[PDB]
Subunit: 389 residues, 4 copies
């Protein structure tokens, strides 16, 4: 009847982004879930405690739970836990699955915050973090110790856009009985679902593409099994780092357009990468959709639908040229941190060294987050900025 | 030219305006989205610099609402815009500002039901004569204009029959006869049709529908062609206390950024659904401005840019019983409910849901038949949407 | 049992402010009502249309309806309708109950907006508005015509704080079969409930005291009968001027503290009025709690609990002195419009004439909205401002 | 001195600080409440003026959150404050920043259950030794300090037994032995007790409870006595990603304005309820710091300003069965649920609701008995509250 999914059918991809994890409010029929902006939940009696499923919003909240169900469906997981930020999701992984004496392999071109929270904080608990090059899966295979509990990949990596072969790394981790965690923030599940490729856990900064509007901060942990999910949920309650109901409402809203947003962003990004690869003031361009991409074979194997909204490039002249460019990049570009949004964002990490170069972050390196503006405004602005470099 | 400046002498392209129009980073903090001014009153520096920072009281104007207004005026091509609590409040403010006892007002006879009602049931008690006519032929409008006519109120496409009105032709008639042309282009969106570009004097929008597009907020907008019209609307909005709230304006500032890609996806889905329905052996008629049998095809091709919209309609064979049974059996992802324009596909019967206070005889005279079904297409996978309709039609 | 009011008992005053019109969410037990930030409501079938009570948020919304039930209980009415602003509530009254040829009596010292929306707008529909002095009920009795449909009182009046004898005016209106509408925004229902005194309709700007935090705009119409309530509700749907769910949530929150807020504000106001009445630069002080108040007998008859947070005074020296004072009133005072808030507000209407004087608004007249700051900071600041006058 | 300025050389009085602390009218518009910065990232003018307007990314700092932080630091009497998603996140950030393998940490054995758990169940796996002792006698703390002790974590009053700890005496001991004194004064609020005034090094607050006081938001705060401590907390908050959101900070900026009058009303109600319970023939024991039989009366009178708080506890005669029956029969306006501090009066059994993972033997050793009932008093009419309790007690 009306209001039911037909039994035995599974919604197709875009339908899940619109409707996944949500049904009309049973009480009123409201098409969107109400915002449970409240801390505590009244119990019918001492015996029917938790009979309606909730007690305290630090532990679980109905709006947050609806978003978690949607995210788990989109990523292909058993369940998801939502957090105040992406960093909270990551540090909850490190907190739950590592103890003194354990070993953790982390991609050496990881997002800066992940790298720092490993080196500067968790390492003081006598946890051994080792940073290696994930572009070759045999590097991971050869670096796993008996003490290794977690292999933490990221693909594409921030900011260099290196790819990690998630299926091969997952095979390696399964054989060694090690947890494979994948940060696929830059990919989004519309381009790559690491759980489909054998990862044990996915970490998402929902701040970036899930939101996509520069509106909220948020994080998510999607677990492949009930055992892992239960561990994450328990520790989230202890750490007090759950997402708020209002943030979950915003993200429930913005996730509905993730497919059409990422399609537009990636079409723009392809055109911008093609323009930059012919510009005489540009030394190198990094985009998984152009022929110069070093890991083109893996990109064709691992990416679905698109090649994403992120790109990078190196301006000729080094740091001084990159600075001149950044200082003269006009609207509609925004000069700032973050990525994944409707508003195109550009930044030069160097201005905002030996180890920097060891990563791949060269002096004139520019990270570009492509939005959904008209691509001719974006290209015209980059062309003008380059004329000052 | 430095970071934070636009290139001088360039007009930003359309999609850029949807993302950035009316909005710059916060001067104080650089926040990429301007903050929500969730506050009622504004402190003044002194008596002599009263209103020197531009604001006094949020019923009169609010900074978040004003940012949204500048963006909407830019998108619709107007001098200025006023934002309201609902689309109906926008419409009522136009009737309140531009009509007085003794005046005559031509309204499309297939107007959105609420417009028809607030005219017939409320403003008519002030001895304003509302005449409801067929706007499909602009000469009907020309020769229905009496010397008391002050306002011509068109809608295109019409809710729910999707009749079109030739906005450019009607505006030429209205300028010749010195009458105000107001056009409700809620169903079109400015991505498909901008009445101000076609000579209308005022545009009214229910931002509830496509501007929002997420079933999240209520809102309305009036976009005025001139400063004289805009100032009248603004003054009366302050008197009637029906301004939009800062929080609603923040939501709409956010959702408007994706209006082009949303409407493109909705319209692509709607074309495929209308083709599917037009071949279906249990469907009597299909109405969609983009299918080749559309009766006003030539006007649609003249007046619609990019797309033919997310709205369609159809009649199921068998009359009322079959339409009711089809409604009761349409599965998810469809939603059975009122409203339209949203990411979530919606289906309804205008006979019960919206045009219920229109007596059946007039209901039919309009075009709202027994088996008539209004469809608002969202952005789900079109194959899920068609699967659901095909199941419901097989049950009908 | 737990979760039930005991049958046959009525909650006392302050309990209604905390809990009136609201019960824990039946679905989850959430102690606060969820925010129904949604426009439309899914229907079970064509036959069970409106079976769950909602269809479209312009017509009715669950959060708004909870607030309406609370407000109706607090004011002692059959029902309430909530609006985007106080002015929307007022203009809905004028729209619903007046037609060409009708006559409307309005207090001549009404809030400026009410006066203007009558004179400048509704008068163009051939509605005859007559402004008279409501301090004497026999003025109302003698001014009622056969065409009179509405008598619109306000007590205390903005800004002069004149009182209207609501019970006597109601008796007069009942005998003439005329609708008595009362704007009791300045009083709040904690000090005066016009429905208890025989008024037919109450109008509230919830912006002022119901909110009390300078946070939201809002309005309410509380009707004494189902017939009146139904008329107001129908026209609200036509006018499209309903309150939003988010605003209703804020007001559901802030109404809980209205009694303790108004108690503190009124204690401060009494002390400030006593200070000003001894200051040599102050010509007159207007406060219903000091002995100089002209309508002291009516204030003692008509006011409950307190004498309110509003006061007024005239500085010696006229307009120039008032301006000097306003320009030198220090924090914690705020120089701005509105009233009723935690933050003390001061304004001089003259700077921000014959008819002005006809009202009672003299040149050096200052309207003071007392907040909940420490009264010694407030008095010290007024003393300093006066030293510049 | 002009409008918008404070009088120079005057310290604003306490209630004024609750209304206005940390907040001035918006410089750009004069908005009396500063807007909600609902945005993630902040645009920079150039490379060389990076962070010149003070913000870059909302995980690190946000303008609305920073306004709330300045207000909280002013109210609690600290150098600075950091705001967090929850009280538990504040507490966990303190344990994460100031403890390392091999360190010893003295915690009150009647600490709030979540604190006890995150110590025992999580941080202990890093080879941090948490020792749980009786803080009612400060010499217990003095002689329990081992040379590995880095942190002494007190709570007063304790959740749920309402035991007090002599904050000034414990701080003197901690300064003599060069150990960090952290105090959770959630149950007290700064209106009743400011641990930083009494020599504590750090205060931790669950703003969820009384700062909010309306059951609306979750939140936490860490208030630091010095710049060195504050900078450590701020740095680690950015690493752990547990900052408060702008919307929650806006809500708390609003609710904090009424904290004094709320706590005054709650505390007046609570005194009357505790007196009523102490005379009731079906009540075994009543615990409230303001009734004359309170065991730590002298410390309460030394350490509590204005009030003795909204929290009380009692045991019903008959043990577990009678307590359960009383719970199942307490009517509205009471609410049966977790949490505390709110306008809405709340009642619960810590045995099931909060301290359930504490085994019964330890449960009793603490003071959490079978018939033990924790009561959070709101601002309803006290006669309705007493009526409800009297009915429930008659059913017990
Ligand atoms: C942004 C980012 C993070 C951190 O998420 P936050 O929401 O900023 O805390 C983690 N991983 C990647 C790849 C990121 O881009
Ligand atoms: C929805 C609608 C309106 C009324 O707008 P509301 O936001 O519902 O008040 C007006 N015109 C059209 C064409 C509509 O569809
Ligand atoms: C403020 C006010 C109004 C108008 O209410 P708004 O919410 O500002 O539209 C009406 N009556 C009185 C007495 C007022 O003070
Ligand atoms: C509530 C509570 C906490 C934990 O705070 P949350 O906001 O629930 O994370 C800490 N200490 C005390 C005394 C508490 O009552």
């Amino acid at each position: 009847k009306a209001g039911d999914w037909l039994p035995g059918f599974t919604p197709r991809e875009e339908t899940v982004y619109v409707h996944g994890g949500v049904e009309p409010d049973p009480l009123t029929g409201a098409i969107l879930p109400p915002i449970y902006q409240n801390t505590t939940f009244v119990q019918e009696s001492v015996e029917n405690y938790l009979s309606k499923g909730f007690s305290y919003s630090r532990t679980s909240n109905p709006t947050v739970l609806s978003l978690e169900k949607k995210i788990a469906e989109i990523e292909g997981g058993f369940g998801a836990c939502c957090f105040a930020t992406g960093m909270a999701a990551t540090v909850t992984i490190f907190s739950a699955f590592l103890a003194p004496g354990d070993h953790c392999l982390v991609t050496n071109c990881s997002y800066g915050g992940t790298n720092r929270c490993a080196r500067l904080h968790f390492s003081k608990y006598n946890i051994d973090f080792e940073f290696i090059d994930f572009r070759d899966p045999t590097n991971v295979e050869k670096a796993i110790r008996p003490q290794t509990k977690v292999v933490f990949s990221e693909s594409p990596c921030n900011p260099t856009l290196y790819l990690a072969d998630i299926e091969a790394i997952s095979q390696i981790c399964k054989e060694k009985k090690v947890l494979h965690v994948c940060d696929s923030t830059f990919a989004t599940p519309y381009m790559m679902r690491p759980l489909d490729l054998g990862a044990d856990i996915v970490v998402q900064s929902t701040t970036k593409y899930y939101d996509g509007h520069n509106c909220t901060l948020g994080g998510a942990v999607i677990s492949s099994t009930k055992e892992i999910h239960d561990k994450v949920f328990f520790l989230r309650n202890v750490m007090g780092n759950i997402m708020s109901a209002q943030t979950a409402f915003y993200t429930l809203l913005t996730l509905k357009t993730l497919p059409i947003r990422v399609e537009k962003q990636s079409a723009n990004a392809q055109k911008i990468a093609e323009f930059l690869s012919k510009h005489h003031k540009v030394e190198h361009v990094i985009y998984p959709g152009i022929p110069s991409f070093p890991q083109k074979e893996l990109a064709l194997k691992q990416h679905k639908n698109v090649h994403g909204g992120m790109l990078a490039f190196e301006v000729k002249g080094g740091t001084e040229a990159g600075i001149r460019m950044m200082n003269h990049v006009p609207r509609p570009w925004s000069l700032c941190e973050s990525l994944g949004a409707c508003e195109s964002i550009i930044t030069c990490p160097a201005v905002f060294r030996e180890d920097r170069l060891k990563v791949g972050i060269t002096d004139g390196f520019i990270r570009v987050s492509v939005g959904i503006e008209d691509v001719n405004d974006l290209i015209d602005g980059l062309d003008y900025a380059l004329s000052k470099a």
